[PDB]
Design a protein around this ligand. Sequence first.
Ligand SMILES: [Cl-]
Ligand SMILES: [Cl-]
Ligand SMILES: [Zn+2]
Ligand SMILES: [Zn+2]
Lengths: 30, 30, 30, 30, 30, 30, 21, 21, 21, 21, 21, 21
Amino acid sequence: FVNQHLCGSHLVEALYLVCGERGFFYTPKT
Amino acid sequence: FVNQHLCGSHLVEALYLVCGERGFFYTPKT
Amino acid sequence: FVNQHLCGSHLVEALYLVCGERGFFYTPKT
Amino acid sequence: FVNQHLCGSHLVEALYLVCGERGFFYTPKT
Amino acid sequence: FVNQHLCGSHLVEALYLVCGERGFFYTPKT
Amino acid sequence: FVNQHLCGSHLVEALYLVCGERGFFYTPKT
Amino acid sequence: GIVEQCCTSICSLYQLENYCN
Amino acid sequence: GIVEQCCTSICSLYQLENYCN
Amino acid sequence: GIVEQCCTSICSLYQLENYCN
Amino acid sequence: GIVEQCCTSICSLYQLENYCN
Amino acid sequence: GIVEQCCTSICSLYQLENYCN
Amino acid sequence: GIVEQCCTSICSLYQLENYCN
Ligand SMILES: [Cl-]
Ligand SMILES: [Cl-]
Ligand SMILES: [Zn+2]
Ligand SMILES: [Zn+2]
């Protein structure tokens, strides 16, 4: 696989991709 | 706003738009 | 909800989200 | 170009790409 | 990573994320 | 149609749009 | 209309072009 | 849950808002 | 226009509704 | 092929990786 | 390449077809 | 956070998994 800049909606779409059924949290404030 | 029919990654996009800087958690069943 | 920068295709995807069945116009020239 | 099968937000994306700076109107039935 | 259910443009997005700078080829049947 | 800047995932989504069943290659290294 | 046509059947980019401003 | 509801039926942006941090 | 309102400067989902039909 | 497999069944990111240049 | 053609500098949908198989 | 990790600086798909539940 690769390392890339994933931002905004693309970041959460990548999280969706990677995590899928596990689910995920997107917490930009940290 | 209108009701939404959102599957897969479209739900994540919608959560992203709705939550902005707050972020969100995505938690499918199973 | 939040305020964010929505640009390009993301802008129209947000319009789709918000307006849905109502439809919308995307008129970047104004 | 090829014919398209476009539902939901994919149609909006396609309209966005097709129309560019002209923008477009999205007008579903009902 | 989780298994994926990817149709249409979602497969292309997934290929894009997976392949990064390598790029990829998209070759549907027929 | 128009000329626009198509980048990243948007570029490959546009390729998908234009090429569809033909398929395409996305080869950013050239 | 186009929104339905593109979903329940198929549509061309040329038909889509009609919807540009 | 919301992920299923939004897919197999419909959901509002207001219901979605519940899932923000 | 919308691009100035949303893209160039932040807008809300309510302000987005300004562009619904 | 992969395009169909990923749609009509499931596919892994590892199978997708095969399609990178 | 495509990135130079489209991303860095504007391209048309026709120029995009250059990258179809 | 994730934005720093991925958006501001490059991250891998493995590092993305850090944010799965
Ligand atoms: Cl972007
Ligand atoms: Cl879909
Ligand atoms: Zn984008
Ligand atoms: Zn979709």
